[PDB]
Design a protein around this ligand. Structure first.
Ligand SMILES: [Zn+2]
Length: 258
């Protein structure tokens, strides 16, 4: 039926409705650190989020998204391997039922407890909808989460989750600053890939940060209390909403560092 992460509609089934799932530039992938090529010509990333305007938080039945005002160049990403300016539209997370799994990308086959995706679209295309149809339309910053110390900047997010427990619920979520979710270092790996949920379009330049951020056990616990289902439906906890690693095929992963 409609796609999800269960036994009957999970990632291994996606190709039936979305044939691009077996495509040549699908994501996520395993990042082999010994085979990644250091590229001296890659520039440092430029993250300008001082003017970010968050608007709302929504449970869409597959994750929760924090949405931003993208009507102007308020929160942008540029530099790195990118040409042009990419506007932040939303961020979401992927997490597991246990601390040993949850991330989409893996590093030398290591899985992290969760993975944050900051989604941005190329302004040359005028809107998000047109950007996903282009090979360089999206830039997604992936940040791994490990369990350790609490991340103060994540607490505002954790605390509103009760209010969007089920699918289709939304809440006003203004004045949230995404700078509170970045690691200290912006060293990264990059490769050409795709959206990791249907429609799985191959329009993403992935930028995966080397340094994970730490969250506490209690923080991640709150994510696992969300529901995949709508209100008044049988309860299905929102856990393990990650797609497994896909074949690298003809692609090279580049590193901004040695
Ligand atoms: Zn994602």
């Amino acid at each position: 039926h409609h796609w999800g992460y269960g036994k009957h509609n999970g990632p291994e089934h996606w190709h039936k409705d979305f044939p691009i799932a077996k495509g040549e530039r699908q994501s996520p992938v395993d990042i082999d650190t010994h085979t990644a090529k250091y590229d001296p010509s890659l520039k440092p990333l430029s993250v300008s989020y001082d003017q970010a305007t968050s608007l709302r938080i929504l449970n869409n039945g597959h994750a929760f998204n924090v949405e931003f005002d993208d009507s102007q160049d308020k929160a942008v990403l540029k530099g790195g391997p990118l040409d042009g300016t990419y506007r932040l539209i939303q961020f979401h997370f992927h997490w597991g039922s246990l601390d040993g799994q949850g991330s989409e990308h893996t590093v030398d086959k290591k899985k992290y407890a969760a993975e944050l995706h900051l989604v941005h679209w190329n302004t040359k295309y005028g809107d998000f909808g047109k950007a996903v149809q282009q090979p360089d339309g999206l830039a997604v910053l992936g940040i791994f989460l490990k369990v350790g110390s609490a991340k103060p900047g994540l607490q505002k997010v954790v605390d509103v989750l009760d209010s969007i427990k089920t699918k289709g619920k939304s809440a006003d979520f203004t004045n949230f600053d995404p700078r509170g979710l970045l690691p200290e270092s912006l060293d990264y790996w990059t490769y050409p890939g795709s959206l990791a949920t249907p429609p799985l379009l191959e329009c993403v330049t992935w930028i995966v940060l080397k340094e994970p951020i730490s969250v506490s056990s209690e923080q991640v616990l709150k994510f696992r209390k969300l529901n995949f289902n709508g209100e008044g439906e049988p309860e299905e906890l929102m856990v393990d909403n990650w797609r497994p690693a896909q074949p690298l095929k003809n692609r090279q992963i580049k590193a901004s560092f040695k």
